[PDB]
Design a protein around this nucleic acid. Structure first.
Length: 279
RNA sequence: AUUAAGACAUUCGUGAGUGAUUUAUUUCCAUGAAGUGGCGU
């Protein structure tokens, strides 16, 4: 059993249907965490997407994901998928087209989850992320903060929350942390991130059905913004080494794009998968 | 080997159909092409 952290990096808008009792303006909402109320993907959706991508190799699917439903013989799965949690999200700016937004609470939860799960590359990542968080907390000193690290991005204005970003020169961002969290990164207070990821500031798209030139239906759709990043955990129950290595190589190859969620025929939820690179 | 295993809230769906920046408003009112001859005592 080797627990591994995979990052998603959605290439398009992601819509994963919540299915829970919806009464508001938006007819189709996305899945949100019960505890933090941040966008997330259920491990059922992850398993379904990965099994659909790999369904053409029957033996790999049978070994790792198990037996298809309505099969006479039932075989257990060997990989355990964990829910995908939002790591960073694109927020709109004025000096640059967008900024990658992460909250200090998201960072702390990531540190706690890596410490809890014992990821393969957890040691150096935990050390560097803890140093970054301590430096950030020292710089903020209990106040609201919006920290960018490139000196050029100094003075960037996050649109929805009219916060101007500041650049503390004391805080170094390591290249691998930049790879994990994204480019053009801003680290905010969790209040700002919660405002930016709530139902009022997430992108809502209008849809209608045209019958003989007139709209029959109309509804509004919530989508996770393009270029968002989510991390999940994969646990291999000591599955066969060759199937595991083939699955990991196909998952990490640049040509492989996974569809998670709804609206597949109109290109929603198309994402890559990135393993935790050694620090 | 444990009241277990397996299962993407997913498929279909054009924010569209009808819609003159238009109705109305005087570039007008005032005014003399007119004043005056002179020497030849």
């Amino acid at each position: 059993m080797t627990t591994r952290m995979y990052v998603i990096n959605t290439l398009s808008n992601m819509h994963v249907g919540s299915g829970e009792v919806n009464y508001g303006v938006i007819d189709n909402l996305i899945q949100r965490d019960s505890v933090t109320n941040l966008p997330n993907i259920n491990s059922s959706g992850l398993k379904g997407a990965i099994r659909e991508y790999f369904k053409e190799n029957e033996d790999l699917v049978r070994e790792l994901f198990g037996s298809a439903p309505r099969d006479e013989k039932t075989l257990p799965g060997k990989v355990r998928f964990f829910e995908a949690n939002l790591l960073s999200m694109p927020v709109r700016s004025d000096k640059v087209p967008f900024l990658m937004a992460i909250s200090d609470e998201v960072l702390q939860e990531l540190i706690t989850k890596m410490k809890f799960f014992n990821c393969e590359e957890a040691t150096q990542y935990i050390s560097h992320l803890s140093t970054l968080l301590d430096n950030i907390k020292t710089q903020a000193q209990g106040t609201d903060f919006a920290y960018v690290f490139d000196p050029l991005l100094q003075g960037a204005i996050i649109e929805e929350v009219s916060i101007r970003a500041t650049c503390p020169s004391h805080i170094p961002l390591q290249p691998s942390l930049k790879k994990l969290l994204g480019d053009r990164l801003v680290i905010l207070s969790h209040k700002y991130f919660s405002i930016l990821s709530d139902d009022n500031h997430l992108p809502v798209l209008s849809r209608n059905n045209l019958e003989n030139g007139q709209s029959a239906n109309l509804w509004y759709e919530q989508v996770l913004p393009r270029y968002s990043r989510l991390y999940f955990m994969l646990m291999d129950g000591n599955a066969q080494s060759e199937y595991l290595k083939k699955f990991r190589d196909t998952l990490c190859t640049p040509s492989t794009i996974i569809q998670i969620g709804a609206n597949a025929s109109i290109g929603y939820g198309y994402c890559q998968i990135s393993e935790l690179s050694p620090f």
